[PDB]
C-alpha cells in the first residue's frame, strides 16, 4: 500500500532531511508564516499584492518550470535540489529519470509525489503532520507501549467518529436545539477552536459551564468519551440553569437559540480573561468569526452623506415578503435589505438647512468570516401573526459584492467597480416545517468532499446538493472562500 | 374524407382498418383491394385504431375524450369508455385481449375492462402529453412515450412506474416496441434518433450481464430523419420507418 521508495528513506537522518525539506517547501504556501509568497495581503482581490512580486513570487519561483519556462499550476518542487518541473510536458518526470531525484512537492497544495510510483504519498501520518511542524514531537505523539506507561499518547480517529456525524435524540421539543448544535459542531472555525483546546483557561465543569458542555459534545461526537447523549444532556442541564424556556421543554425559535449559544460562548471568554476586554473590539471566537458591521448612512437632499453610523451584527435578518411575490431569490432579499428608503424622521441638514425627508440606506461596512442569515418567515396582520412559507432560492456560492458600502457610491464615478468579488460558500441550512407557533426543525450541513448530510434529531442521512437547494431555508450559514 | 391518423392490419392478413378525422372507421379487403364496410359511432376525430391480438374485435381513440370498442360484424359500437378530461391520444390491448390501455394529453394513462367499461387502474406522471404505448408479451409491463421525452415503464399491478428510462434529448417520442420475449425494448423519436433500451437492469428479473442515465444499451443516429415506428420481426432484427431523407 505505502510507497516503498519513501519507506526505504525513512530510517533516521534521511527521514529528518525529508522532514525539513517538506517543512521548508510548505512554508511559502502557509498563510500563518513570514516566508509566505502568496496569501499574506488580501485587499480588492484574494490573490493581489503577493502572488506576483518579481523577487520571490509563487508564480515565477514555484509555478514556473525550469526546462520549458512555462507558468503552469501543476508543478513540482524537488526534494533534492532547487529545481521545479511541470506535469504537462513531463519535465518533472524527465528530471527524475535523469538525476534520480524521485520526490517532488506539488506547488498548489504541498502534496508529496513519488515519480517512481506515479502517485502521491498521502497515507503516511507522519508526512501529513510533519509539514505543520510536528516532526520533532513524533515519538511522544505516536501511540506506543512506551508512551502509554508514562505519558499520554495519540491515535488516529475511529472510523465511525472521524466526521463527527451523530444523532441527538429529541428530549421533548429539542429540535430547535439539535438543528443549531449540528451547525455549530460541523462549523470548521468552531470545531478547530474546540479541538485546539482554547477553553483550557476554564472554570472547569460541564454541569455549570455552557462552553464546557459544547466541548463535551465535540469530544463525544469526534472522539471517545462517557456516553453518546452525555454532552447534549449536559448542555440541557446548563441551558436550564441559565434560561428554562430555551432548555427544550417547549417549542422555541432556532435563531434565538443560535444567538443564545454564541452570547454564552462570548460570556465564557469574558469570564476567563485576567482583565476585562472591551467589547467591541472583543478577541473571543464569536467576535472574530461571526462579527461584521453595517454602515447606516444618512444622505440629505444636497447629497451630504453625514452622519454615518456603524452598527455591529452577528447575523443579518432579511425580509422575504417582496421576494415571495417576485422571483423568489436570496439575492433579491439582499437587494431589498440594501435598498434606499426615504424616511418619516425629523431631518435638519447641517450644510444646506433642508428639512426634506432623509434618504437612509443600509450597506455592509465589515464582512465576517462566517455570514449567518435569518430569513424573516413571518408577517403580522389583523391581530394575528402568520408564517411566510414561500420557497426562496439560495445559491451554493454567494457573492457579497453589490451589498458592501462605497460600491453604490462609486456607481457612475471614476472608481466604479473598485470593490471586488467576495465569494462565500454555503455550508449549512436550518429549515422549519409547521406554522408560526408549532412545528419542527431540521438541519442540513456540508463537509469535505462536497458531501451533504441531513440531521433530523436522531436520524442522520446522506443527501444530494440538488435536494438541499429545494429546502425551505430559515437560517443560512455561509463561510468566506475568496 | 379527412386526413388519416391511424392504420392497422388483420393478423390473418387479408383485411385492413383505417381511422381518420372524419369520424369514420373503414374496412378493406386485400385480395381485391376494396372497401367493404363503414363504421360510425364517434363524435370527433379518431386518432389510432388497433385490432385484437386474435382478431374479431378492434378499438379506436378520439378527440371526443372517449374510446369505443368495436367488433367487425356489428356496425355500431359494443362498449364506450369515458374517463379522460382531455383527448384520448392512443389505445392498445393487453396480450390476453381482455384489457385496453388509453393514454391522453391530460398527462395520465388508464386501463379498462372491455366488458365492464370502467377503469381498473390509472397511472400518473410524465409532465407533458402522451403519444405512443406498448405492452411486454408476458403481462407485467406497459410503455409510456410522450412530449416530455422520458420513456416510463409501468407495472399494471403497482400502478407505479418500475423504471424511468432517461434519454432522447428534448423532443417528442412517437413510437416504441418490445421484443419477442420482453428482454429488450426500443424507443423511436423525433430527435432524429432511435434508442435501444435494456429493460431488466433494475426490475424483478435483474439481468445485468456486466463487463443522462443508464438502462441505455445503444443509440443509432439517422441522416436528419424523424422516425415514426418500428416492427420487430420474428427474428432478431427490427424494421423501421422514417421520412425526410436528407
Amino acid at each position: 500500500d505505502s510507497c516503498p521508495h519513501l519507506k526505504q528513506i525513512l530510517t533516521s537522518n534521511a527521514k529528518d532531511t525529508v522532514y525539513r525539506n517538506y517543512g521548508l517547501a510548505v512554508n511559502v504556501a502557509l498563510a500563518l508564516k513570514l516566508r509566505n509568497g502568496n496569501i499574506p495581503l488580501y485587499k480588492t482581490s484574494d490573490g493581489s499584492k503577493v502572488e506576483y512580486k518579481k523577487l520571490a513570487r509563487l508564480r515565477n519561483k514555484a509555478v514556473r518550470c525550469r526546462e520549458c519556462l512555462e507558468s503552469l499550476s501543476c508543478t513540482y518542487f524537488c526534494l533534492q535540489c532547487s529545481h521545479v518541473g511541470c506535469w504537462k510536458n513531463g519535465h518533472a518526470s524527465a528530471h527524475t529519470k535523469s538525476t534520480g531525484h524521485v520526490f517532488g512537492i506539488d506547488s498548489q497544495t504541498g502534496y508529496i509525489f513519488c515519480f517512481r510510483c506515479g502517485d502521491y504519498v498521502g497515507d503516511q501520518r507522519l508526512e501529513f503532520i510533519r509539514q505543520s511542524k510536528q516532526g520533532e514531537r513524533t515519538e511522544p505523539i505516536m501511540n506506543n507501549l512506551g508512551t502509554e506507561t508514562i505519558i499520554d499518547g495519540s491515535r488516529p480517529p475511529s472510523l465511525k467518529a472521524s466526521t463527527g456525524l451523530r444523532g441527538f435524540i429529541n428530549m421533548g421539543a429539542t429540535c430547535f436545539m439539535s438543528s443549531i448544535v449540528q451547525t455549530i459542531v460541523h462549523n470548521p472555525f468552531v470545531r478547530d477552536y474546540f479541538l485546539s483546546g482554547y477553553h483550557a483557561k476554564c472554570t472547569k465543569k460541564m454541569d455549570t459551564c455552557i462552553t464546557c458542555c459544547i466541548d463535551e459534545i465535540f469530544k463525544v461526537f469526534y472522539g471517545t468519551d462517557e456516553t453518546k447523549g452525555y454532552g447534549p444532556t449536559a448542555l440541557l442541564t446548563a441551558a436550564w440553569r441559565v434560561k428554562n424556556s430555551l432548555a427544550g421543554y417547549s417549542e422555541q425559535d432556532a435563531h434565538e437559540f443560535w444567538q443564545f449559544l454564541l452570547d454564552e460562548i462570548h460570556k465564557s471568554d469574558t469570564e476567563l480573561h485576567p482583565e476585562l476586554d472591551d467589547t467591541s473590539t472583543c478577541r473571543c471566537i464569536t467576535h472574530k468569526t461571526f462579527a461584521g458591521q453595517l454602515q447606516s448612512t444618512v444622505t440629505c437632499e444636497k447629497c451630504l452623506h453625514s452622519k454615518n453610523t456603524v452598527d455591529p451584527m452577528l447575523d443579518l435578518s432579511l425580509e422575504i415578503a417582496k421576494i415571495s411575490k417576485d422571483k423568489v431569490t436570496l439575492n433579491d432579499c439582499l437587494d431589498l435589505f440594501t435598498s434606499k428608503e426615504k424616511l418619516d424622521s425629523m431631518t435638519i441638514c447641517s450644510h444646506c438647512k433642508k428639512e426634506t425627508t432623509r434618504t437612509k440606506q443600509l450597506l455592509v461596512r465589515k464582512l465576517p468570516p462566517i455570514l449567518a442569515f435569518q430569513l424573516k418567515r413571518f408577517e403580522h396582520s389583523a391581530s394575528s401573526s402568520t408564517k411566510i412559507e414561500t420557497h426562496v432560492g439560495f445559491p451554493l456560492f454567494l457573492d457579497m459584492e453589490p451589498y458592501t458600502v462605497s460600491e453604490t457610491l462609486n456607481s457612475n464615478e471614476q472608481g466604479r467597480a473598485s470593490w471586488g468579488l467576495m465569494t462565500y460558500q454555503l455550508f449549512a441550512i436550518v429549515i422549519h416545517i409547521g406554522s408560526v407557533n408549532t412545528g419542527h426543525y431540521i438541519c442540513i450541513i456540508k463537509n469535505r468532499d462536497g458531501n451533504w448530510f441531513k440531521f433530523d434529531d436522531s436520524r442522520i442521512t446522506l443527501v444530494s446538493q440538488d435536494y438541499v437547494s429545494k429546502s425551505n431555508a430559515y437560517l443560512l450559514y455561509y463561510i468566506l472562500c475568496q | 374524407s379527412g386526413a388519416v391518423y391511424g392504420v392497422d392490419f388483420s393478423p390473418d392478413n387479408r383485411y385492413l382498418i383505417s381511422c381518420s378525422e372524419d369520424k369514420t372507421v373503414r374496412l378493406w379487403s386485400l385480395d381485391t383491394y376494396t372497401c367493404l364496410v363503414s363504421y360510425k359511432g364517434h363524435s370527433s376525430s379518431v386518432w389510432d385504431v388497433k385490432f385484437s391480438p386474435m382478431g374479431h374485435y378492434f378499438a379506436t381513440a378520439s378527440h371526443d375524450q372517449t374510446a369505443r370498442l368495436w367488433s367487425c360484424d356489428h356496425i355500431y359500437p359494443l362498449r364506450i369508455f369515458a374517463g379522460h378530461l382531455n383527448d384520448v391520444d392512443c389505445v392498445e390491448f393487453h396480450p390476453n385481449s381482455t384489457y385496453l390501455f388509453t393514454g391522453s394529453s391530460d398527462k395520465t394513462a388508464r386501463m379498462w375492462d372491455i366488458a365492464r367499461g370502467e377503469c381498473v387502474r390509472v397511472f400518473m406522471g410524465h409532465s407533458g402529453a402522451i403519444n405512443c404505448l406498448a405492452v411486454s408479451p408476458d403481462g407485467r409491463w406497459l410503455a409510456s412515450a410522450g412530449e416530455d421525452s422520458v420513456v416510463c415503464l409501468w407495472d399494471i399491478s403497482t400502478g407505479r412506474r418500475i423504471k424511468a428510462m432517461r434519454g432522447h434529448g428534448r423532443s417528442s417520442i412517437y413510437s416504441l416496441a418490445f421484443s419477442r420475449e420482453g428482454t429488450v425494448l426500443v424507443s423511436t423519436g423525433a430527435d432524429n434518433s432511435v434508442r435501444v433500451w435494456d429493460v431488466k437492469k433494475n426490475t424483478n428479473s435483474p439481468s445485468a450481464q456486466p463487463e443522462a442515465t443508464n438502462d441505455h444499451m445503444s443509440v443509432y443516429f439517422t441522416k436528419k430523419t424523424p422516425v415514426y415506428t418500428v416492427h420487430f420481426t420474428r427474428r432478431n432484427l427490427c424494421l423501421a420507418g422514417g421520412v425526410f431523407g436528407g
Binding site: 506539488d106 497544495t109 502521491y120 498521502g122 488516529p156 421533548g172 432548555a247 421543554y249 448530510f453 446522506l462 | -
Partner: protein, 117 residues
C-alpha cells in the same frame, strides 16, 4: 492570439484540475490505508454528494434508512400502539440527579422538575 489564449486558459484549467484531483486521490488513499474495512466515512447527518459507486454511508432513495442502513422511524406504521418499532418513545436515560430511568422524550420536562430540588 486565439491559440495563445486557449493555451493560457488550458494551463490555468489543467493546473486547477490537477490540484483538485491530487487533493481527492491523497484523501481517499489516506482513508483506505487508515481503514481497510472502510464502508463509510465519518460523513455528516446532512446528505453529501448524491449516491455513486464510491458512495460511502448508506444512502436510501426511499429516505427511510440512516447512514448505517438502519431504520430510525421514517414509517408511522404500527398497530396503533407500540408503533415506530420503538424509536425514542421506548428509550430511557438514567438521570444522575435523582437516580431514575427517565423516558428519553421526557428528559427535558423531567430535568426542569428534578433539578428544582
Amino acid at each position: 492570439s486565439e491559440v495563445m489564449q486557449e493555451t493560457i486558459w488550458d494551463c490555468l484549467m489543467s493546473n486547477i484540475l490537477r490540484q483538485i484531483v491530487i487533493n481527492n486521490i491523497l484523501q481517499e488513499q489516506a482513508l483506505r490505508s487508515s481503514i481497510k474495512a472502510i464502508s463509510n466515512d465519518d460523513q455528516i447527518s446532512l446528505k453529501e454528494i448524491n449516491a455513486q459507486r464510491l458512495k460511502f454511508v448508506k444512502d436510501d432513495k426511499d429516505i427511510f434508512n440512516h447512514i448505517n442502513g438502519k431504520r430510525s422511524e421514517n414509517k408511522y406504521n404500527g398497530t396503533g400502539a407500540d408503533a415506530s418499532n420503538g424509536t425514542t418513545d421506548t428509550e430511557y436515560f438514567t438521570c444522575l440527579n435523582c437516580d431514575r430511568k427517565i423516558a428519553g422524550n421526557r428528559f427535558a420536562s423531567h430535568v426542569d422538575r428534578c433539578l428544582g430540588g
